[PDB]
Design a protein around this ligand. Sequence first.
Ligand code: LMU
Ligand code: 156
Length: 235
Amino acid sequence: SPQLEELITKVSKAHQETFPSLCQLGKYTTNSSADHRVQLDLGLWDKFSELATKCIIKIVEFAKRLPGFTGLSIADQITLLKAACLDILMLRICTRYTPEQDTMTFSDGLTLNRTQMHNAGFGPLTDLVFAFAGQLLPLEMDDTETGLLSAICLICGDRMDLEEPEKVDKLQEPLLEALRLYARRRRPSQPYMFPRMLMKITDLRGISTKGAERAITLKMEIPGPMPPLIREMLE
Ligand SMILES: CCCCCCCCCCCCO[C@H]1O[C@H](CO)[C@@H](O[C@H]2O[C@H](CO)[C@@H](O)[C@H](O)[C@H]2O)[C@H](O)[C@H]1O
Ligand SMILES: CC1(C)CCC(C)(C)c2cc(C(=O)/C=C/c3ccc(C(=O)O)cc3)ccc21
């Protein structure tokens, strides 16, 4: 129980220090391709892809602050990150959804409307991502819960080509315990919150699978290769 309490705050702090809250950010806008959907606005793609690269690095930084992660083999660390990074990217942007404005906000404050998200590369996946974001709102998750959920998504023993899946399973166990404890303590009158959060991982996997599919078609729309850390994620 003291050890579990420390795990909660280690993960929470790792999340917050690699992922500013919507409240913390100085929002700004762009007038690029703001009012009609097009196949791709390359200026929006360039900026979005640069921001995704930076957030990938931040997810690696987050991962390495999770207790036990750096005790996994370097191969397993890489395997886990490649399997989960798109999921965590999508969860991250969807936690920065402002429903009143139908916008999402990136880590530098860039705030895009739905049409600009489409035009930045989401394309035919845009409305499904926004729907996921919409359906996260009734959970009213806080940063600690988002951080713990992200950690549970990453540290999972089912990933293909893991060398030591039992070791990964044992690292996941206390994260599950921590999220249940935290979530029930915070909102004891809503006991379905923990299982609803866990089921969002499945939903997330669905949309990340579609995101990988979208990456294949986007690759045909852009004039060069995707940034190298994005290619690492997608392989
Ligand atoms: C699954 C997708 C990827 C799979 C594994 C790929 C892992 C690659 C991540 C290692 C990145 C190398 O990390 C090394 O260079 C980074 C970029 O100059 C530095 O990154 C630094 O600058 C960034 C600015 O872009 C900041 O947001 C980081 O917080 C900061 O640490 C790191 O401080 C340094 O340790
Ligand atoms: C694979 C690739 C590049 C192309 C296919 C699509 C458009 C579906 C896609 C979507 C995402 C994503 O949802 C989330 C991106 C993201 C970028 C930056 C921030 C942040 O600044 O905090 C947080 C989140 C990330 C990557 C990609």
